[PDB]
């Protein structure tokens, strides 16, 4: 059946553009997420940092503790969550307790 | 190749040899190559030739 959709039609018959957003949660997680806010790197009186998901408080530094080009984490013998390289500039970082 | 939690993680590492190979007496680690998030039921596989 055909729609008329003349400009003088009543509100009950006026056309409405309907957009439906469908979301799937199957057993196959991927990188389909929303946008995240990005800030500037801060050290020197350590501030709280949330680098790519993990959160810490240590002193960001530019030490020569070079990781592998595929690793994105850092852990000591005590499984301490060491700093991760910069997700943007790929600069290697390291953290220590802030006194 | 692995299929766990939907991620088809592929590990690989190119290692040169010197003579005939029979899985020689050497150690070498494999680095992750890709992390395809498809979650495909993979129960068979065939080596593709040219």
């Amino acid at each position: 059946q055909s729609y008329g959709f003349r400009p003088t039609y009543g509100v009950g018959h006026q056309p409405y553009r309907v957009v439906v957003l469908s979301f799937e949660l199957l057993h196959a997680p991927a990188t389909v997420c929303g946008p995240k806010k990005s800030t500037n790197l801060v050290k020197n009186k350590c501030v709280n940092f949330n680098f790519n998901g993990l959160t810490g408080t240590g002193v960001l530094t530019e030490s020569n503790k070079k990781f592998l080009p595929f690793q994105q984490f850092g852990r000591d013998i005590a499984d301490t969550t060491d700093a991760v390289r910069d997700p943007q500039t790929l600069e290697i970082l390291d953290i220590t307790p802030c006194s | 190749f692995k299929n766990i939690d939907g991620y088809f993680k592929i590990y690989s590492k190119h290692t040169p040899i010197n003579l005939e190979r029979d899985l020689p007496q050497g150690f070498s680690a494999l680095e992750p190559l890709v992390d395809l998030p498809i979650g495909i039921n993979i129960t068979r596989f065939q080596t593709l030739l040219a």
């Binding site: 690793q71 994105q72 | 680690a29 030739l49």
Partner: peptide
């Protein structure tokens, strides 16, 4: 369309300490 001429028998051999990979990106 394909031609079936690649099928052949199998064999066995002794391996070594192979297949070790990085279980995590840490």
């Amino acid at each position: 369309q394909c031609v079936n001429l690649i099928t052949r028998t199998q064999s066995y051999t002794n391996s070594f300490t192979r297949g070790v990979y990085y279980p995590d990106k840490v």
